[PDB]
Amino acid sequence: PAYRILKPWWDVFTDYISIVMLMIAVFGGTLQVTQDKMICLPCKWVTKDSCNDSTGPTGIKYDLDRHQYNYVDAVCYENRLHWFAKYFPYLVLLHTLIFLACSNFWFKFPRTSSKLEHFVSILLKCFDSPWTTRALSETGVLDKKEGEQAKALFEKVKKFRTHVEEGDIVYRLYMRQTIIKVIKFALIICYTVYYVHNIKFDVDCTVDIESLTGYRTYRCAHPLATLFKILASFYISLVIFYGLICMYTLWWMLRRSLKKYSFESIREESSYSDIPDVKNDFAFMLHLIDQYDPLYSKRFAVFLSEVSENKLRQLNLNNEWTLDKLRQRLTKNAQDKLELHLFMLSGIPDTVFDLVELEVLKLELIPDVTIPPSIAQLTGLKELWLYHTAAKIEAPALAFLRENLRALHIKFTDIKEIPLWIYSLKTLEELHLTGNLSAENNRYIVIDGLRELKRLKVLRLKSNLSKLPQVVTDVGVHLQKLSINNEGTKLIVLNSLKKMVNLTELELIRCDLERIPHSIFSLHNLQEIDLKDNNLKTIEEIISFQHLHRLTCLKLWYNHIAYIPIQIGNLTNLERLYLNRNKIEKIPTQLFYCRKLRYLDLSHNNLTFLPADIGLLQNLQNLAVTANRIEALPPELFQCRKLRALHLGNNVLQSLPSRVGELTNLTQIELRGNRLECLPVELGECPLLKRSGLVVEEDLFSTLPPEVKERLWRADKE
Amino acid sequence: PAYRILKPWWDVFTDYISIVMLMIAVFGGTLQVTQDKMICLPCKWVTKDSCNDSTGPTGIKYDLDRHQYNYVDAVCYENRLHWFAKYFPYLVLLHTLIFLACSNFWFKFPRTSSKLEHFVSILLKCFDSPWTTRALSETGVLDKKEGEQAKALFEKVKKFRTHVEEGDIVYRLYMRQTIIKVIKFALIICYTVYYVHNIKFDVDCTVDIESLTGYRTYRCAHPLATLFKILASFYISLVIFYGLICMYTLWWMLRRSLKKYSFESIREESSYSDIPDVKNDFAFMLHLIDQYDPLYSKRFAVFLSEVSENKLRQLNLNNEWTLDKLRQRLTKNAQDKLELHLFMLSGIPDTVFDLVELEVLKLELIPDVTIPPSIAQLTGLKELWLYHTAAKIEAPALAFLRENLRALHIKFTDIKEIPLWIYSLKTLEELHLTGNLSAENNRYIVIDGLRELKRLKVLRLKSNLSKLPQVVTDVGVHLQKLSINNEGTKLIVLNSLKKMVNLTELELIRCDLERIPHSIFSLHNLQEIDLKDNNLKTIEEIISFQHLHRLTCLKLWYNHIAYIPIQIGNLTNLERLYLNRNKIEKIPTQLFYCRKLRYLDLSHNNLTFLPADIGLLQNLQNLAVTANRIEALPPELFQCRKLRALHLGNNVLQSLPSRVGELTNLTQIELRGNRLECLPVELGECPLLKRSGLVVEEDLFSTLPPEVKERLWRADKE
């Protein structure tokens, strides 16, 4: 059936003893009801209310009719026969019924019956699940339905365990009913042994009946006395055994503290040490199961272990993300390297470590992930991005990283979630800290270990830092690229950059400087300068940039500057100048003294006209003047032949010179938003020009001869 | 079974008490039928109808044979034995049957039996459904069959709830049967305790039998009197326990108002506060289940919460609106970018945010729309359309929109139903308000937050403005394209356009101007101006538009202007001129002085003829003369070769000049509605001519020679 596992050997022994006692009770009751007469005979001679018992023999004449004998039998039976001899079977029946009631009370009381049914259903479901079979076998691939069933079983087992530990009702009812059984056995044995000698075959009744029969005392015989006596002896022996069993049950329930379950055997033998001991009302059920069969408890033990749940989740992720299905999700970043980005995953699948070709791994919002040593299988992995991810490392994996790690990007909201092994990677070249290093008024101790990286070359601090850290200044002695994104927070250098003399990039995006630092003049090794959104008003510091012999990538876009300084003519080695999103009205001629410009870009600025000496800069390749008040392009703009990109959008350009055919290198040109009424007929005289190379509105697209349109459409096939 | 959950502990206790009372009844009945004799003996000496009880002892001779004894036994048993002694087992059987019948009445009465069966079936189905398991686990991917089953179960649970709250029948029957049990217990205890003293071993019967026996009174013995007495005491104890249990049931049902279920503990702990209290005949069943097991009620409670229904809708939407369905459902908008339109959907599927190529999102009539942080997964999204939707957005998604959102479209009728985080979108470029911002005696306070967004370029207020809000005046100094549509509502400026200095588009559609405002003159930087449906009468203010040297797209259609002023010739920059749907009798020649017109259109006008100066517009591309009484077309007009479109509908034309054949750039021309009858042959010679461009009547199309029609059709494929 179903509840056979919930009854220990003593319970079934008591059940069978109760059945035998019920048979005794019904046999005695049938005996009494069918015939329990008391055959009484008056005796002539009386010796203190007792019969004296003092040619051929002859019978004794009593002159009593049959009905008088029946009456004296009835009176002597009701009055002078001991109540035990008359009511033994009924007392046995009542005691057996009470024993059965107190044995089955917890099975029938709904408050505990529901809990028992829930526990047995859960135990049966957890006993036969193949996940338990696999876990016991281990002491590769499982079906999705099986994994989902195991996950649901884990969840409901945990919820049931949480719900049950506060009950403490099944154990209380079991203990109370066992106490009732023990005390009932004590009383039954005492009174039955005391009164069993009170039943006998021959009895004497002096019932005081003279006016109806004529004799006072009667010698009476009870035919069932011997049978009732042997039945009482049998019932006494049965109750003795029942009481011994109940005493054993009490001793078992009072010498173990059954509210606490050990659960140590499996966790010390199978090494499943992460199984906490259960509280009251659940240790009792497990003890009962142990008394029935320890294997059920052993198989149910796996569902309470965190290791089992964790490896179940890992197997679920392995099934969900196969190798072929995961190579599909591989993507390429801007740097053209294989990138695997995990988003909102429950963890790191172990199948991702089979991709030897993996090069970039990005982890974003995965909770409490431990990088398994299987990462040692990978070879080409160089970038690891942990955005809001706390990753814990193992010993072989940490050494593998310290040997073969190149890049690391981490974003964090609190310091406590940053890796504690980040400093152990002494070969990391580039680091990207986009968290919030401003702890509780600390001197950036959380990054004080940045000096450990002796091969650190790129820094990407974006943490709203109020000032450049001492540790950063120390580590910048061998730093190639320094990038600070202060998000508009005011930053003060205060003579802190001259320590670094090997920096090549000094990106200062949103540092809110408002002034070009005076220490940047000491970094003659700087080549790329970016000052986006620093609220810079005066940029006359170009008067000191000529000492920097490698200044070639001066970028000053997204700023508020009025007039370009003449000191630009001081510099000569400028290759990429960017001054977009500014308010500049006049373009100086001396700016063109830098004949090495390649990617000059002046777009979204309050410009008015293009100087006619731009042809003097024949090395120009790109020039984007989108969103500017440029009335017309001067012809000298087309003197250059090396120009490639030319973006003139949202500009008031009424006319376009026909000499566009002079430039063969003009690849992409953008003229959307301009006030053009007709297009040059030499626009098609460019061998290298595709559909994406021309960006104009359709309405004016047909004003040119259709032949060049057909040529362009023919060249746009592939 | 199945109804064990519907029987509290008192019900099963009363069932077992009834079983034991039935055992007492059958035992007493078998005793009485098998032997209920009364052994009577006549007594010689009588003292007031009662036996007096006044060498060797000898028996007493009554001279009665056995049959006389049997007769007196029968007579005394029938007449002078108390009816209780004879009929105790039968009364016990009757009471037990009545108790069982009143306990099982509701289970056997079909009217409540069907309701109970349906309720227990629904409760069992909702107990083990994995949807409840997930809901309780949360306090990913769900199978389609499981979701469909959950939706069907939700619907049938709601239907059953609607069906049951009107019943109020099961509770009435339960209360009535408990009252019956209590009153029956009261009567039973009263009469049974009163009459239990009437059963006794020794009785005296004065039965008046003299002619048959010769003795008057008899002393009789009732052998079963003591057994019936102890049985009656046992039955009285059982009835006492039964009555106490019924009293407890009455107290439980009369101090809780079981018609109303609190349902608040789960809804206050699990945050499922949206669970309305159930009414009568359904709260009672929940109370019964709680008395059996609260877990069944807790698991069934999820189907009664609106939150569970909403999240099941969301899950079914995600399972239904698959990634491929949304990918295929993407369209191309008029702006030539990927767009997705959601109409009356219950929510936004999470697979929508998996289309990284999506660029425009349209939402209409989506109630309680929540933007998840997973919208940050989208990257190409640039425009948001919130038509009558109150959008709730979290912090990370709000930052994502603050960084990567270009345009916004919202439709509303009330102030409150617009998002309150609109001003948190810093990078917004376009705004589309199509509501009613005219609140109760306010200076448009709600839109006063527009000063926060300094990056806005396009504003599309449509709220039937009466006075231009001061916020719009202050914010228009950096605005590019302002479109206002009041749907005929009066608009007043009072020097409100002078604040702007850089605006270019001033669409004032249906603003009920009725006169050209005098504040528009200061906006010399305007390039596009439209005054459609503004009830204008005279436009002689062109002399004040000479300050506008960038005005090239003046639009004045859907108005009623008597005549065109001669001041049009003073301007020369007109490129797109519109005076459609007006009543102008003649076009002055000075208007043709502007040679750079390209999209001049005068349709639905009361024109008589066109001056030959129209032939000097060699730069005109599209000209629409539909619904004009132009009897003849000047030959000078056809001399131009830059015409692109000539739309002629509902005009007085009797023939077409043969000089149209010299046109080679004529892309399209329409002659619908005209009473033409002949098509000149030279029309068939044009490098760019297809069937779509030239649409005329089918009958008139057959008048030209066919040898060119076949050639054109052969080139009509591609």
- Rounded distance between C-alpha atoms, residue B656 and residue B704, angstroms: 13
State CA A601 to chain mean position distance.
50
- Nearest Cα residue to B286 out of B274, B297, B277: B297
- Nearest Cα residue to B452 out of B468, B481, B431: B431
Question: What pairs with residue B221 in β-bridges?
Answer: B39, B202
Question: What pairs with residue B332 in β-bridges?
Answer: B338
Nearest-by-Cβ selection for B552 from A110, A111, A675: A675
Query: How far B688 CA sits from the closest chain A CA (Å)?
Result: 9
Q: Do A66 and B66 touch (CB under 8 A)?
A: yes
- Nearest Cα residue to A656 out of A646, A664, A643, A665: A646
For residue B471, which amino acid is it? V
DSSP B645-681: EEE--S---S---GGGGG-SS--EEE-TT-------G
Task: Kindly calculate the radius of gyration of chain B based on its CA atoms and give it in whole angstroms.
Answer: 51
Interior/surface letters A188-219, b for 16+ CB within 10 angstroms, e for the rest: beeebeebbeebeeebebbbebebbbbbbbbb
A37 touches chain B (CB under 8 A): no
Place of tokens 């002399």: B543
- Rounded distance between C-alpha atoms, residue A60 and residue A63, angstroms: 9
Which chain B residues are closer than 8 Å to A71 by Cβ? 39, 41, 221
The two structure tokens encoding residue A616? 């003097």
B502 touches chain A (CB under 8 A): no
Q: Do A211 and B51 touch (CB under 8 A)?
A: yes
Cβ atoms of A499 and A475 closer than 8 Å: no
Neighbour tally for A703: CB within 10 Å: 17
How many Cα atoms occupy the beta-carbon half-sphere of A75 within 13 Å? 29
Task: Kindly calculate the radius of gyration of chain A based on its CA atoms and give it in whole angstroms.
Answer: 51
Question: Quick one: B522 exposed, middle or buried, by C-beta within 10 A (0-12, 13-18, 19+)?
Answer: middle
Going across the sheet that includes A505-507, the strands are: A331-332, A338-343, A360-364, A383-387, A407-411, A430-433, A458-461, A481-484, A505-507, A528-530, A553-555
Residue from B41, B124, B354, B525 whose CB has the most chain A CBs within 10 Å, to mutate? B41
The two structure tokens encoding residue B429? 């470029």
- Rounded distance between C-alpha atoms, residue B411 and residue B431, angstroms: 11
Neighbour tally for B99: CB within 10 Å: 25
**Determination technique used:** cryo-EM
Question: What pairs with residue A623 in β-bridges?
Answer: A646
For residue A171, which amino acid is it? Y
- Rounded distance between C-alpha atoms, residue A448 and residue B361, angstroms: 47
| A402 CB-near residues (< 8 Å, 6+ apart) | A424, A425, A426, A427
Nearest-by-Cβ selection for A78 from B223, B377, B644: B223
For residue A282, which amino acid is it? F
- Nearest Cα residue to A70 out of B80, B215, B37: B37
Q: Packing angle between helix B306-320 and helix B130-138, nearest 10 degrees?
A: 110
Cβ atoms of B284 and B174 closer than 8 Å: yes
User: Would you tell me which residues 155-194 of chain B have a C-beta closer than 8 angstroms to some C-beta of chain A?
Assistant: none
- Measured CA distances, B541 to A376, B264, B432 (Å): 81, 72, 31
Nearest-by-Cβ selection for B221 from A42, A74, A108: A74
Give the three-class secondary structure for A38: coil
- Rounded distance between C-alpha atoms, residue B596 and residue B525, angstroms: 19
* Resolution of the coordinates, Å: 3.5
Which chain B residues are closer than 8 Å to A114 by Cβ? 292-293, 295
- Nearest Cα residue to B615 out of B553, B566, B659, B674: B659
- Rounded distance between C-alpha atoms, residue A532 and residue A574, angstroms: 18
Give the three-class secondary structure for A26: helix
- Nearest Cα residue to A407 out of A359, A469, A341, A350: A359
- Rounded distance between C-alpha atoms, residue A549 and residue B102, angstroms: 107
Cβ atoms of B388 and B362 closer than 8 Å: no
Q: Do A74 and B225 touch (CB under 8 A)?
A: no
Which chain A residues are closer than 8 Å to B575 by Cβ? 677
Query: How far B512 CA sits from the closest chain A CA (Å)?
Result: 31
Task: Provide the Cα torsion A48, A53, A58, A61; round to 10°.
Answer: 30
- Rounded distance between C-alpha atoms, residue B632 and residue B657, angstroms: 9
The two structure tokens encoding residue A441? 């008024």
Q: How far apart are the first and last CA of chain B?
A: 78
Residue from B23, B293, B377, B379 whose CB has the most chain A CBs within 10 Å, to mutate? B293
- Rounded distance between C-alpha atoms, residue B685 and residue B689, angstroms: 8
